[PDB]
Tab-separated table of N, CA and C and ligand atoms in Angstrom:
chain	number	residue	atom	x	y	z
A	1	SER	N	14.110	-2.632	4.397
A	1	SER	CA	13.156	-3.902	3.891
A	1	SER	C	13.982	-5.439	4.569
A	2	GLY	N	12.973	-6.638	4.882
A	2	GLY	CA	12.990	-7.474	6.075
A	2	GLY	C	12.273	-8.146	5.342
A	3	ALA	N	11.926	-8.967	5.564
A	3	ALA	CA	10.562	-10.380	5.607
A	3	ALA	C	10.638	-11.540	7.633
A	4	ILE	N	9.611	-12.059	7.531
A	4	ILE	CA	8.962	-12.621	8.252
A	4	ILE	C	9.689	-13.978	7.178
A	5	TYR	N	10.020	-15.009	7.983
A	5	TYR	CA	10.521	-16.751	7.282
A	5	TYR	C	9.386	-17.455	8.173
A	6	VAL	N	8.283	-18.400	8.259
A	6	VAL	CA	7.003	-18.662	8.830
A	6	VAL	C	7.453	-20.142	8.364
A	7	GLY	N	7.102	-21.328	8.993
A	7	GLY	CA	6.786	-22.592	7.582
A	7	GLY	C	7.676	-22.024	6.113
A	8	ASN	N	6.014	-22.457	5.595
A	8	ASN	CA	7.387	-22.536	4.295
A	8	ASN	C	6.986	-20.820	3.955
A	9	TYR	N	6.213	-19.613	4.521
A	9	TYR	CA	5.959	-18.802	4.029
A	9	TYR	C	7.260	-18.032	4.444
A	10	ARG	N	6.373	-16.768	2.868
A	10	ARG	CA	7.994	-15.246	3.731
A	10	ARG	C	6.601	-14.193	3.587
A	11	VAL	N	6.628	-13.291	4.876
A	11	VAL	CA	5.606	-12.525	5.157
A	11	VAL	C	6.628	-10.866	4.756
A	12	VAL	N	6.008	-10.457	3.213
A	12	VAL	CA	7.176	-9.385	2.998
A	12	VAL	C	6.095	-8.086	2.950
A	13	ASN	N	6.860	-7.062	2.813
A	13	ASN	CA	5.919	-6.135	2.443
A	13	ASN	C	4.967	-5.287	0.651
A	14	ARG	N	3.539	-5.538	0.901
A	14	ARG	CA	2.841	-5.223	-0.600
A	14	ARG	C	4.519	-4.681	-1.816
A	15	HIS	N	3.929	-4.368	-1.534
A	15	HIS	CA	5.024	-2.811	-1.783
A	15	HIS	C	6.352	-2.954	-2.628
A	16	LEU	N	7.550	-3.782	-1.124
A	16	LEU	CA	8.416	-4.463	-1.871
A	16	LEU	C	9.021	-5.940	-2.299
A	17	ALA	N	7.075	-6.448	-2.535
A	17	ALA	CA	7.796	-7.643	-3.004
A	17	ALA	C	7.616	-8.738	-4.127
A	18	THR	N	8.673	-8.506	-4.454
A	18	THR	CA	9.896	-8.985	-5.898
A	18	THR	C	9.085	-9.972	-7.060
A	19	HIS	N	9.602	-9.576	-7.958
A	19	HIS	CA	8.615	-10.616	-8.741
A	19	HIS	C	8.737	-12.386	-8.968
A	20	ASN	N	9.654	-12.480	-8.428
A	20	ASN	CA	9.901	-13.966	-7.187
A	20	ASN	C	8.352	-14.485	-6.549
A	21	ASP	N	7.547	-13.615	-5.130
A	21	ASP	CA	7.335	-13.831	-4.702
A	21	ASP	C	5.454	-13.327	-4.828
A	22	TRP	N	5.387	-12.649	-6.294
A	22	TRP	CA	4.205	-12.525	-7.436
A	22	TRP	C	4.523	-13.699	-8.035
A	23	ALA	N	5.249	-14.429	-8.214
A	23	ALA	CA	5.183	-15.372	-9.114
A	23	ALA	C	5.030	-16.768	-8.484
A	24	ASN	N	4.713	-16.226	-6.663
A	24	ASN	CA	4.979	-17.790	-6.296
A	24	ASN	C	3.477	-17.227	-4.770
A	25	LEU	N	2.706	-16.568	-5.310
A	25	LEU	CA	1.694	-15.812	-4.705
A	25	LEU	C	0.867	-17.107	-3.484
A	26	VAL	N	1.241	-16.357	-2.484
A	26	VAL	CA	-0.464	-17.479	-1.338
A	26	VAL	C	-1.253	-16.820	-1.572
A	27	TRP	N	-1.085	-14.612	-0.889
A	27	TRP	CA	-1.722	-14.153	-0.264
A	27	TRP	C	-1.911	-13.055	-0.129
A	28	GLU	N	-2.743	-12.020	-0.874
A	28	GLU	CA	-1.655	-10.056	-1.140
A	28	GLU	C	-3.019	-9.654	-0.201
A	29	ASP	N	-2.955	-8.343	0.426
A	29	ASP	CA	-3.466	-7.186	0.010
A	29	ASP	C	-3.130	-6.053	0.598
A	30	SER	N	-3.439	-4.809	-0.346
A	30	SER	CA	-3.176	-3.811	-0.209
A	30	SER	C	-3.546	-2.869	0.484
A	31	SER	N	-5.128	-2.851	0.759
A	31	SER	CA	-5.477	-1.907	2.336
A	31	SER	C	-4.008	-2.543	3.268
A	32	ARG	N	-3.682	-3.625	3.482
A	32	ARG	CA	-2.519	-3.703	4.674
A	32	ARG	C	-1.213	-4.087	3.866
A	33	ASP	N	-0.996	-3.573	3.772
A	33	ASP	CA	0.217	-3.338	3.618
A	33	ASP	C	1.237	-4.487	3.604
A	34	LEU	N	0.668	-5.701	2.641
A	34	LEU	CA	1.251	-7.145	3.374
A	34	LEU	C	0.948	-8.547	1.766
A	35	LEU	N	1.935	-9.042	1.664
A	35	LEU	CA	1.782	-10.166	0.903
A	35	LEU	C	2.983	-11.040	1.465
A	36	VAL	N	2.840	-12.847	0.596
A	36	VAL	CA	2.684	-13.800	1.200
A	36	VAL	C	2.590	-14.398	0.235
A	37	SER	N	3.920	-15.260	0.047
A	37	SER	CA	4.696	-16.416	-0.584
A	37	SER	C	4.940	-17.134	-0.577
A	38	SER	N	4.851	-18.198	-1.400
A	38	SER	CA	5.973	-19.669	-0.523
A	38	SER	C	7.093	-19.744	-0.713
A	39	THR	N	8.045	-20.170	0.260
A	39	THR	CA	9.361	-21.014	0.021
A	39	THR	C	9.634	-22.747	-0.104
A	40	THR	N	10.983	-23.183	-0.774
A	40	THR	CA	10.546	-24.641	-0.519
A	40	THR	C	11.326	-24.889	0.905
A	41	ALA	N	12.264	-23.489	1.731
A	41	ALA	CA	13.241	-24.371	3.063
A	41	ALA	C	11.773	-23.091	3.846
A	42	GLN	N	11.623	-24.421	5.172
A	42	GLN	CA	11.121	-24.544	6.534
A	42	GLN	C	12.107	-22.792	7.293
A	43	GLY	N	11.021	-21.729	7.769
A	43	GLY	CA	11.924	-20.221	8.400
A	43	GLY	C	11.498	-21.568	9.619
A	44	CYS	N	12.068	-19.972	10.349
A	44	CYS	CA	12.990	-20.205	11.680
A	44	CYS	C	11.608	-19.179	12.876
A	45	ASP	N	10.801	-17.849	12.090
A	45	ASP	CA	10.014	-17.617	12.946
A	45	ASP	C	9.165	-17.928	13.890
A	46	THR	N	8.042	-17.574	14.827
A	46	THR	CA	7.027	-18.084	14.802
A	46	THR	C	6.279	-16.848	14.907
A	47	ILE	N	4.870	-16.984	14.836
A	47	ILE	CA	3.891	-15.634	14.175
A	47	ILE	C	3.337	-15.497	16.385
A	48	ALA	N	2.944	-14.365	17.493
A	48	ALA	CA	2.635	-13.955	18.402
A	48	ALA	C	0.990	-14.092	17.862
A	49	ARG	N	-0.065	-15.607	19.693
A	49	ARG	CA	-1.047	-15.187	18.729
A	49	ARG	C	-1.617	-14.581	20.278
A	50	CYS	N	-2.081	-13.153	20.717
A	50	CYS	CA	-2.410	-12.530	21.825
A	50	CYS	C	-2.518	-11.206	21.749
A	51	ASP	N	-2.494	-10.652	22.473
A	51	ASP	CA	-3.038	-8.316	21.946
A	51	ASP	C	-1.700	-7.955	22.905
A	52	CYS	N	-0.940	-8.890	23.462
A	52	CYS	CA	0.314	-7.297	24.235
A	52	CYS	C	0.152	-6.506	22.653
A	53	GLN	N	0.279	-5.241	23.864
A	53	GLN	CA	1.247	-3.766	23.497
A	53	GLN	C	2.396	-3.044	23.586
A	54	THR	N	3.534	-3.905	24.065
A	54	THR	CA	4.468	-3.428	24.180
A	54	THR	C	5.931	-4.699	23.439
A	55	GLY	N	6.410	-4.213	22.839
A	55	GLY	CA	7.619	-5.107	21.988
A	55	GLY	C	8.269	-4.039	21.559
A	56	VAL	N	9.362	-5.169	20.713
A	56	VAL	CA	10.756	-4.996	20.555
A	56	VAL	C	10.171	-5.162	19.019
A	57	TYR	N	11.432	-3.648	18.236
A	57	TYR	CA	11.352	-3.491	17.152
A	57	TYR	C	12.633	-2.807	16.338
A	58	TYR	N	13.195	-3.899	14.923
A	58	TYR	CA	14.334	-3.493	14.352
A	58	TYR	C	14.298	-2.533	13.855
A	59	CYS	N	15.211	-1.499	13.813
A	59	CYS	CA	15.396	-0.525	13.140
A	59	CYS	C	16.456	-0.364	12.159
A	60	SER	N	16.645	-0.660	11.210
A	60	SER	CA	18.169	-0.556	9.895
A	60	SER	C	17.881	0.508	9.948
A	61	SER	N	17.784	2.064	10.125
A	61	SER	CA	18.485	2.949	9.777
A	61	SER	C	19.441	3.497	11.277
A	62	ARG	N	19.419	2.786	12.163
A	62	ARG	CA	20.138	2.894	13.644
A	62	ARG	C	20.517	1.790	14.047
A	63	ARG	N	20.204	0.434	13.430
A	63	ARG	CA	21.067	-0.259	14.052
A	63	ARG	C	20.887	-1.209	14.848
A	64	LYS	N	19.729	-0.567	15.467
A	64	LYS	CA	19.515	-0.953	16.788
A	64	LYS	C	17.685	-1.673	16.543
A	65	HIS	N	17.747	-2.196	17.985
A	65	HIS	CA	16.157	-2.450	18.640
A	65	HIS	C	15.690	-1.649	19.447
A	66	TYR	N	14.548	-1.127	19.204
A	66	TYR	CA	14.451	-0.252	20.192
A	66	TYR	C	13.021	-1.254	21.006
A	67	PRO	N	12.632	-1.136	22.496
A	67	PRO	CA	11.302	-1.561	22.766
A	67	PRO	C	10.563	-0.303	22.937
A	68	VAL	N	8.851	-0.447	22.739
A	68	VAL	CA	8.152	0.489	21.885
A	68	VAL	C	7.613	-0.347	22.961
A	69	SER	N	6.429	0.937	23.499
A	69	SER	CA	4.419	0.787	23.456
A	69	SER	C	3.682	0.843	22.254
A	70	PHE	N	2.546	0.783	22.034
A	70	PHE	CA	2.202	0.624	19.717
A	70	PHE	C	1.069	0.146	20.530
A	71	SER	N	0.056	0.763	19.977
A	71	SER	CA	-1.724	0.479	20.226
A	71	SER	C	-2.545	-0.926	19.221
A	72	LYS	N	-3.424	-1.144	18.721
A	72	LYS	CA	-4.224	-2.374	18.694
A	72	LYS	C	-4.350	-1.846	17.490
A	73	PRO	N	-4.090	-3.401	16.409
A	73	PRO	CA	-4.551	-2.979	15.343
A	73	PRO	C	-5.520	-1.440	14.662
A	74	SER	N	-5.854	-0.824	13.885
A	74	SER	CA	-7.002	-0.216	13.907
A	74	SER	C	-6.654	0.164	12.194
A	75	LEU	N	-7.993	1.198	11.925
A	75	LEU	CA	-7.521	2.012	10.698
A	75	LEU	C	-7.252	3.516	10.782
A	76	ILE	N	-6.023	3.451	9.705
A	76	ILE	CA	-5.597	5.018	10.192
A	76	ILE	C	-4.874	4.894	9.189
A	77	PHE	N	-5.415	6.530	9.023
A	77	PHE	CA	-5.187	7.772	7.967
A	77	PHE	C	-3.631	7.689	7.824
A	78	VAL	N	-3.588	7.179	6.783
A	78	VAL	CA	-1.775	7.161	6.299
A	78	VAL	C	-1.087	8.346	5.069
A	79	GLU	N	-0.504	9.170	5.302
A	79	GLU	CA	-0.119	9.942	4.269
A	79	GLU	C	0.394	9.367	3.200
A	80	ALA	N	0.593	9.917	1.714
A	80	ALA	CA	1.156	9.633	0.650
A	80	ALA	C	2.838	9.713	0.646
A	81	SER	N	2.530	7.925	0.262
A	81	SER	CA	4.299	8.007	-0.224
A	81	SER	C	4.791	8.083	-1.359
A	82	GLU	N	6.009	7.606	-1.408
A	82	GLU	CA	5.998	7.152	-2.756
A	82	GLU	C	5.267	5.302	-3.395
A	83	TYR	N	4.589	4.281	-2.853
A	83	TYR	CA	4.221	3.886	-3.293
A	83	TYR	C	2.593	3.509	-3.181
A	84	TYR	N	1.820	4.183	-2.057
A	84	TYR	CA	0.471	4.127	-2.320
A	84	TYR	C	0.401	6.105	-1.991
A	85	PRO	N	-0.752	6.384	-2.533
A	85	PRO	CA	-1.899	7.669	-1.735
A	85	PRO	C	-2.050	7.389	-0.726
A	86	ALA	N	-1.974	8.725	-0.352
A	86	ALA	CA	-3.162	9.212	0.642
A	86	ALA	C	-4.302	8.368	1.364
A	87	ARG	N	-4.067	6.844	1.802
A	87	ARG	CA	-5.248	6.608	2.529
A	87	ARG	C	-5.550	5.920	3.796
A	88	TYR	N	-6.580	5.239	3.767
A	88	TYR	CA	-6.585	4.199	4.829
A	88	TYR	C	-5.836	3.042	5.122
A	89	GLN	N	-5.207	2.389	6.402
A	89	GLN	CA	-4.517	1.907	5.958
A	89	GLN	C	-5.030	0.810	7.110
A	90	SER	N	-5.311	-0.548	7.332
A	90	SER	CA	-5.984	-1.450	8.125
A	90	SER	C	-5.102	-1.883	8.683
A	91	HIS	N	-5.343	-2.786	10.305
A	91	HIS	CA	-4.491	-3.767	10.322
A	91	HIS	C	-2.981	-2.900	10.682
A	92	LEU	N	-3.176	-1.681	11.422
A	92	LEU	CA	-1.948	-1.128	11.412
A	92	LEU	C	-1.713	-0.635	12.684
A	93	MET	N	-0.870	-0.893	13.708
A	93	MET	CA	-0.941	-0.739	14.840
A	93	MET	C	0.342	1.134	15.093
A	94	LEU	N	1.279	2.196	15.600
A	94	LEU	CA	1.636	2.374	15.778
A	94	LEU	C	2.643	2.646	16.923
A	95	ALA	N	3.451	3.641	17.189
A	95	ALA	CA	4.546	3.871	18.389
A	95	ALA	C	5.347	5.289	17.960
A	96	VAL	N	6.068	5.324	18.978
A	96	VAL	CA	6.885	6.265	18.735
A	96	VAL	C	8.089	6.388	18.703
A	97	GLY	N	9.365	6.264	17.972
A	97	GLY	CA	10.081	5.681	17.797
A	97	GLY	C	11.068	6.614	16.083
A	98	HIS	N	11.702	5.787	15.661
A	98	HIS	CA	12.746	6.440	13.997
A	98	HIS	C	12.271	5.199	13.179
A	99	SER	N	12.074	5.829	12.470
A	99	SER	CA	11.664	4.977	10.974
A	99	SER	C	11.974	6.177	9.702
A	100	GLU	N	12.814	5.394	8.339
A	100	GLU	CA	12.825	6.343	7.897
A	100	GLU	C	11.992	4.901	6.655
A	101	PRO	N	12.166	5.613	5.273
A	101	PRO	CA	11.093	4.621	3.830
A	101	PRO	C	12.111	2.896	3.455
A	102	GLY	N	12.965	2.381	4.708
A	102	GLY	CA	13.607	1.622	3.463
A	102	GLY	C	14.056	1.071	5.180
A	103	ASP	N	13.054	1.232	6.594
A	103	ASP	CA	12.950	0.410	7.893
A	103	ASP	C	11.622	-0.898	7.496
A	104	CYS	N	11.521	-0.174	6.827
A	104	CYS	CA	10.096	-1.264	6.324
A	104	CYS	C	10.568	-2.559	6.360
A	105	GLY	N	10.009	-3.189	7.119
A	105	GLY	CA	10.075	-4.817	6.962
A	105	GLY	C	10.844	-5.620	8.185
A	106	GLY	N	11.179	-4.782	8.968
A	106	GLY	CA	12.047	-4.831	10.085
A	106	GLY	C	11.344	-5.124	10.989
A	107	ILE	N	10.943	-6.390	11.724
A	107	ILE	CA	10.212	-6.887	12.676
A	107	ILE	C	9.568	-6.778	14.292
A	108	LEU	N	8.646	-6.428	14.938
A	108	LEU	CA	8.292	-6.245	16.109
A	108	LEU	C	7.917	-6.919	16.516
A	109	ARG	N	8.262	-7.467	17.500
A	109	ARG	CA	8.240	-8.920	18.368
A	109	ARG	C	7.502	-8.973	19.660
A	110	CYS	N	6.996	-9.402	20.346
A	110	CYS	CA	6.667	-9.292	22.028
A	110	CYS	C	7.657	-10.815	22.468
A	111	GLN	N	6.545	-11.671	23.997
A	111	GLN	CA	7.128	-11.911	23.974
A	111	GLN	C	6.186	-14.005	23.890
A	112	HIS	N	5.478	-13.585	22.970
A	112	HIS	CA	4.939	-14.685	21.988
A	112	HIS	C	5.370	-15.295	20.886
A	113	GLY	N	6.128	-14.088	20.338
A	113	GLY	CA	6.957	-14.546	19.238
A	113	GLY	C	6.476	-12.945	18.115
A	114	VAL	N	6.700	-13.225	16.495
A	114	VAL	CA	6.955	-11.978	15.882
A	114	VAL	C	5.218	-11.281	15.963
A	115	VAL	N	5.246	-10.376	16.266
A	115	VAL	CA	3.160	-9.346	15.804
A	115	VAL	C	3.561	-8.925	14.690
A	116	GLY	N	4.690	-8.521	13.987
A	116	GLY	CA	4.751	-7.575	12.874
A	116	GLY	C	5.078	-7.209	12.165
A	117	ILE	N	5.381	-6.288	10.740
A	117	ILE	CA	6.139	-5.387	10.128
A	117	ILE	C	6.511	-4.007	10.249
A	118	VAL	N	7.347	-3.576	10.132
A	118	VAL	CA	7.861	-1.580	10.792
A	118	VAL	C	6.955	-2.016	8.311
A	119	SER	N	5.400	-0.771	8.407
A	119	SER	CA	5.324	-0.732	7.090
A	119	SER	C	5.173	1.488	6.963
A	120	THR	N	5.075	1.963	8.155
A	120	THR	CA	4.826	3.421	8.287
A	120	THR	C	5.271	3.750	8.766
A	121	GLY	N	6.277	5.365	8.893
A	121	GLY	CA	6.904	6.062	9.365
A	121	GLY	C	7.198	7.264	8.989
A	122	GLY	N	7.089	8.215	10.081
A	122	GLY	CA	7.529	8.911	9.796
A	122	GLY	C	7.686	10.337	11.329
A	123	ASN	N	7.915	11.868	11.441
A	123	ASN	CA	8.063	12.656	12.742
A	123	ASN	C	7.579	12.069	13.887
A	124	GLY	N	8.650	11.330	14.039
A	124	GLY	CA	8.915	9.932	15.301
A	124	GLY	C	7.983	9.288	15.832
A	125	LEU	N	7.496	8.801	14.276
A	125	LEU	CA	6.520	7.718	14.716
A	125	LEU	C	7.124	6.690	13.144
A	126	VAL	N	6.425	5.099	14.455
A	126	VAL	CA	6.429	3.752	12.858
A	126	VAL	C	5.271	3.135	12.831
A	127	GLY	N	5.032	2.411	11.833
A	127	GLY	CA	3.671	2.322	11.779
A	127	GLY	C	4.132	0.642	11.426
A	128	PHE	N	3.545	-0.424	11.682
A	128	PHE	CA	3.454	-1.857	12.418
A	128	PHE	C	2.141	-2.034	11.274
A	129	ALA	N	2.255	-3.127	10.231
A	129	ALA	CA	1.313	-4.503	10.100
A	129	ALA	C	1.303	-5.707	10.290
A	130	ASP	N	-0.296	-5.280	11.531
A	130	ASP	CA	0.282	-7.088	12.268
A	130	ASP	C	-0.233	-7.879	11.324
A	131	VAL	N	0.417	-8.810	11.936
A	131	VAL	CA	0.466	-10.665	11.520
A	131	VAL	C	-0.699	-11.157	12.745
A	132	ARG	N	-0.505	-10.728	13.699
A	132	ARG	CA	-1.526	-12.015	14.947
A	132	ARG	C	-2.505	-12.554	14.209
A	133	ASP	N	-4.060	-12.017	13.642
A	133	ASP	CA	-4.689	-12.397	13.517
A	133	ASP	C	-4.444	-13.816	11.841
A	134	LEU	N	-3.326	-13.720	11.340
A	134	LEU	CA	-3.287	-14.601	10.156
A	134	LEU	C	-2.610	-16.139	10.767
A	135	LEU	N	-4.270	-16.887	10.860
A	135	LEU	CA	-3.543	-17.581	11.803
A	135	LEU	C	-3.960	-19.153	11.117
A	136	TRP	N	-3.537	-18.755	9.390
A	136	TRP	CA	-2.954	-20.330	9.365
A	136	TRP	C	-1.289	-19.687	8.390
A	137	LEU	N	-1.056	-18.273	8.586
A	137	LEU	CA	0.555	-18.964	8.925
A	137	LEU	C	1.477	-19.721	10.210
A	138	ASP	N	0.381	-20.365	9.969
A	138	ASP	CA	1.264	-21.345	10.964
A	138	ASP	C	0.206	-23.082	10.601
A	139	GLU	N	0.098	-23.059	9.548
A	139	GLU	CA	-0.412	-24.326	9.343
A	139	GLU	C	0.084	-24.553	7.703
A	140	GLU	N	-0.443	-25.640	7.123
A	140	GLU	CA	-0.164	-26.345	5.656
A	140	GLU	C	0.450	-24.537	4.704
B	1	LIG	C1	9.361	3.560	7.805
B	1	LIG	N1	8.313	4.037	7.651
B	1	LIG	N2	8.703	5.420	6.546
B	1	LIG	C2	7.927	6.194	5.465
B	1	LIG	C3	7.544	4.781	5.297
B	1	LIG	C4	7.151	4.806	3.794
B	1	LIG	O1	7.387	5.586	3.282
B	1	LIG	N3	6.290	3.962	3.852
B	1	LIG	C5	5.612	3.602	2.657
B	1	LIG	C6	4.783	2.007	2.322
B	1	LIG	C7	3.629	3.269	2.877
B	1	LIG	C8	2.399	2.229	3.773
B	1	LIG	O2	1.316	3.820	3.487
B	1	LIG	C9	1.794	4.079	2.750
B	1	LIG	N4	3.608	3.917	1.994
B	1	LIG	N5	7.581	3.917	5.987
B	2	ZN	ZN1	2.792	-11.275	22.623
């Protein structure tokens, strides 16, 4: 589990969105595994605006933050899970690292701010849904 809290937005994995998220919906995209809902309180996270390929992510199944190198956001074929059939996921970045299904929502960050959230995993790989192209998260 986990979310990004930027301005009056909450960014979560679409497959983990709650009824309150769907009832206060701003934007959602199943191909990216992302959903954004509106919040009453202002958040403290800042979004990175960059092309970094090194950063740190939080792994809840280890209670640890790990430094990683990750690929640029791409269209990758991801195997079936309990939330999606095997399909192409867009705007996804891969790294070598531990993950498990409940690690989704952990933040990946670089020197400039939040880069994305854990979305996919298996066999010593972790995949992150990028948010750096969502420029509108920084305003209104
Ligand atoms: C870190 N991690 N390890 C496994 C999973 C997982 O099952 N993701 C669920 C969301 C998803 C994206 O594409 C297909 N399913 N996440
Ligand atoms: Zn960066």
